[PDB]
Amino acid sequence: GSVQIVYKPVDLSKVTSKCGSLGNIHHKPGGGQVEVKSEKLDFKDRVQSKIGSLDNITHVPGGGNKKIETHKLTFRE
Amino acid sequence: GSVQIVYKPVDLSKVTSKCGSLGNIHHKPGGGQVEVKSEKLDFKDRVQSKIGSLDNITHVPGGGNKKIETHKLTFRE
Amino acid sequence: GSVQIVYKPVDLSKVTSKCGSLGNIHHKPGGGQVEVKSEKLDFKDRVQSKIGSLDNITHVPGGGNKKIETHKLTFRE
Amino acid sequence: GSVQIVYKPVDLSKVTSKCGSLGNIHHKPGGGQVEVKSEKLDFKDRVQSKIGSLDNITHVPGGGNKKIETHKLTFRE
Amino acid sequence: GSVQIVYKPVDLSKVTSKCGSLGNIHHKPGGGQVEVKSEKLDFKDRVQSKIGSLDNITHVPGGGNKKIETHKLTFRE
Amino acid sequence: GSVQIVYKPVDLSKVTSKCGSLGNIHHKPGGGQVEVKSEKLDFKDRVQSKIGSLDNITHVPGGGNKKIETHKLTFRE
């Protein structure tokens, strides 16, 4: 018997952006209040967690564009 | 018997951005209040965690563009 | 029997940015208040953790562009 | 002619209070936001004024009792 | 002619208070935000004023009792 | 003609307080933010004023009791 495999995807695409001025942006939060209460935690495996935050962000990229791409190949008898 | 594999993906893409001035950006939080209470923690394996934060960010990149790409190949009898 | 493998991905892509002035950026937080309370911690394996923060950031790169890329190959009888 | 006046009010009253413990009192405001806008002010005579406040109070007297009392007398030809 | 005046008010009153423990009192404001805008001010006579405050108080007297009392007398031909 | 005046008010009153322990009192403000803007001020006569405050107080007297009392007398032809 015989087996042959060719895996040759060709990627030629683009992700692009154009802009003038981003200009006046304001973020003026009047601070709230947070309370959290707990007895025991057991984050045993691959947990991602966040507790009692009160958290502010101003993410303002000039681009902010993104590409994600994944390839796989598997073989058995 | 025989086996042959060729793994030759060709990547030619782009991620790009263009901008004028990013200019006036403001972030003026009036500070809140956070309280968190707990008895025991047991973060046994690969945990990522954050507790009682009260946290402010102004992330302003001129680009901020991103690409992610992953390849794999596996073999058995 | 025989086995042959060729692993030759060709990467030719780009991640790029262009900008004028980034200019006026302000971050003027009115400081909040944080309290956190706990009895025991047991961060046994590969934990990443942060408690009672009250933390401010102004990350302003001229670029900020990123690429991530990973390759693998595996073999057995 | 003749005139005679006697002004002799007799005040014997009381204002009084009795209490146990005043105990658990909480005041935990999540801070709001106030904006006020104006062009000209002309507070010419005996004005009492307050603008753009955002103001918190916890007045907790053990007594807090009050008395007010006023007397007058007037004469003419 | 003749005129006679007697002004002899007799004040014998009391203002009083009694208390146990005043105990647990909390005041934990999550700080708000205030903005005020104006062009001209002209507080010409006996003005009392307050602008753009953001102000916190915990007045906790053991007494806090008050008395106010005023007397007057006037005469003419 | 003749005029006679007697002004003899007799004041015998009291203002009083009694207390146990004043005990646990807390004041933990999460700091707000204040902005005030103006062009001209003209506080010409007997003005009392306060601008752009952001101000915290914990007034805790053991007494705090008060008395105010005023007397007057006037005469003419």
Side-chain angles (χ1 to χ4, degrees):
Chain A
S2 184
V3 182
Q4 278 77 14
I5 294 174
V6 177
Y7 189 94
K8 292 187 178 181
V10 173
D11 306 303
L12 300 169
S13 61
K14 69 177 71 178
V15 188
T16 67
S17 174
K18 296 186 180 71
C19 194
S21 53
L22 287 174
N24 291 357
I25 296 167
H26 291 259
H27 188 66
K28 296 173 58 174
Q33 182 152 350
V34 176
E35 293 179 353
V36 183
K37 292 181 181 179
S38 188
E39 295 187 0
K40 294 186 181 180
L41 283 69
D42 291 279
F43 300 166
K44 190 170 293 185
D45 187 11
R46 214 183 298 180
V47 170
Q48 178 174 342
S49 184
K50 187 174 182 175
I51 306 179
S53 60
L54 184 55
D55 180 20
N56 302 308
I57 301 180
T58 60
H59 182 59
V60 186
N65 303 110
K66 187 180 298 183
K67 178 176 175 181
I68 299 181
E69 186 182 78
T70 62
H71 307 89
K72 294 185 67 178
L73 183 63
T74 301
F75 200 100
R76 293 184 179 163
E77 184 173 14
Chain B
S2 184
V3 182
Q4 278 77 14
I5 294 174
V6 177
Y7 189 94
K8 292 187 178 181
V10 173
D11 306 303
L12 300 169
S13 61
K14 69 177 70 178
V15 188
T16 67
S17 174
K18 296 186 180 71
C19 194
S21 53
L22 287 174
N24 291 357
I25 296 167
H26 291 259
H27 188 66
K28 296 173 58 174
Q33 182 152 350
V34 176
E35 293 179 353
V36 183
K37 292 181 181 179
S38 188
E39 295 187 0
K40 294 186 181 180
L41 283 69
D42 291 279
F43 300 166
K44 190 170 293 185
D45 187 12
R46 214 183 298 180
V47 170
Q48 178 174 342
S49 184
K50 187 174 182 175
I51 306 179
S53 60
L54 184 55
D55 180 20
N56 302 308
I57 301 180
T58 60
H59 182 59
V60 186
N65 303 110
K66 187 180 298 183
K67 178 176 175 181
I68 299 181
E69 186 182 78
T70 62
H71 307 89
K72 294 185 67 178
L73 183 63
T74 301
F75 200 101
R76 293 184 179 162
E77 184 173 14
Chain C
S2 184
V3 182
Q4 278 77 14
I5 294 174
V6 177
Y7 189 94
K8 292 187 178 181
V10 173
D11 306 303
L12 300 169
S13 61
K14 69 177 70 178
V15 188
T16 67
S17 174
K18 296 186 180 71
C19 194
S21 53
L22 287 174
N24 291 357
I25 296 167
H26 291 259
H27 188 66
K28 296 173 58 174
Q33 182 152 350
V34 176
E35 293 179 353
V36 183
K37 292 181 181 179
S38 188
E39 295 187 0
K40 294 186 181 180
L41 283 69
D42 291 279
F43 300 166
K44 190 170 293 185
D45 187 11
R46 214 183 298 180
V47 170
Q48 178 174 342
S49 184
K50 187 174 182 175
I51 306 179
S53 60
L54 184 55
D55 180 20
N56 302 308
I57 301 180
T58 60
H59 182 59
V60 186
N65 303 110
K66 187 180 298 183
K67 178 176 175 181
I68 299 181
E69 186 182 78
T70 62
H71 307 89
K72 294 185 67 178
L73 183 63
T74 301
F75 200 100
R76 293 184 179 163
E77 184 173 14
Chain D
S2 184
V3 182
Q4 278 77 14
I5 294 174
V6 177
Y7 189 94
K8 292 187 178 181
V10 173
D11 306 303
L12 300 169
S13 61
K14 69 177 70 178
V15 188
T16 67
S17 174
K18 296 186 180 71
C19 194
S21 53
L22 287 174
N24 291 357
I25 296 167
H26 291 259
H27 188 66
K28 296 173 58 174
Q33 182 152 350
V34 176
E35 293 179 353
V36 183
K37 292 181 181 179
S38 188
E39 295 187 0
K40 294 186 181 180
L41 283 69
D42 291 279
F43 300 166
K44 190 170 293 185
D45 187 12
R46 214 183 298 180
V47 170
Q48 178 174 342
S49 184
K50 187 174 182 175
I51 306 179
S53 60
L54 184 55
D55 180 20
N56 302 308
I57 301 180
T58 60
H59 182 59
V60 186
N65 303 110
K66 186 180 298 183
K67 178 176 175 181
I68 299 181
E69 186 181 78
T70 62
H71 307 89
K72 294 185 67 178
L73 183 63
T74 301
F75 200 100
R76 293 184 179 163
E77 184 173 14
Chain E
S2 184
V3 182
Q4 278 77 14
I5 294 174
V6 177
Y7 189 94
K8 292 186 178 181
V10 173
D11 306 303
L12 301 169
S13 61
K14 69 177 70 178
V15 188
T16 67
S17 174
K18 296 186 180 71
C19 194
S21 53
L22 287 174
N24 291 357
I25 296 167
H26 291 259
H27 188 66
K28 296 173 58 174
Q33 182 152 350
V34 176
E35 293 179 353
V36 183
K37 292 181 181 179
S38 188
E39 295 187 0
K40 294 186 181 180
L41 283 69
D42 291 279
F43 300 166
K44 190 170 293 185
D45 187 12
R46 214 183 298 180
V47 170
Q48 178 174 343
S49 184
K50 187 174 182 175
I51 306 179
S53 60
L54 184 55
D55 180 20
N56 302 308
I57 301 180
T58 60
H59 182 59
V60 186
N65 303 110
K66 186 180 298 183
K67 178 176 175 181
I68 299 181
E69 186 182 78
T70 62
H71 307 89
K72 294 185 67 178
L73 183 63
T74 301
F75 200 100
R76 293 184 179 162
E77 184 173 14
Chain F
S2 184
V3 182
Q4 278 77 14
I5 294 174
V6 177
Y7 189 94
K8 292 187 178 181
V10 173
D11 306 303
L12 300 169
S13 61
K14 69 177 70 178
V15 188
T16 67
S17 174
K18 296 186 180 71
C19 194
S21 53
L22 287 174
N24 291 357
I25 296 167
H26 291 259
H27 188 66
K28 296 173 58 174
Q33 182 152 350
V34 176
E35 293 179 353
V36 183
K37 292 181 181 179
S38 188
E39 295 187 0
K40 294 186 181 180
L41 283 69
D42 291 279
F43 300 166
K44 190 170 293 185
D45 187 12
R46 214 183 298 180
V47 170
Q48 178 174 342
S49 184
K50 187 174 182 175
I51 306 179
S53 60
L54 184 55
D55 180 20
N56 302 308
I57 301 180
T58 60
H59 182 59
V60 186
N65 303 110
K66 187 180 298 183
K67 178 176 175 181
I68 299 181
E69 186 182 78
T70 62
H71 307 89
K72 294 185 67 178
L73 183 63
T74 301
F75 200 100
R76 293 184 179 163
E77 184 173 14

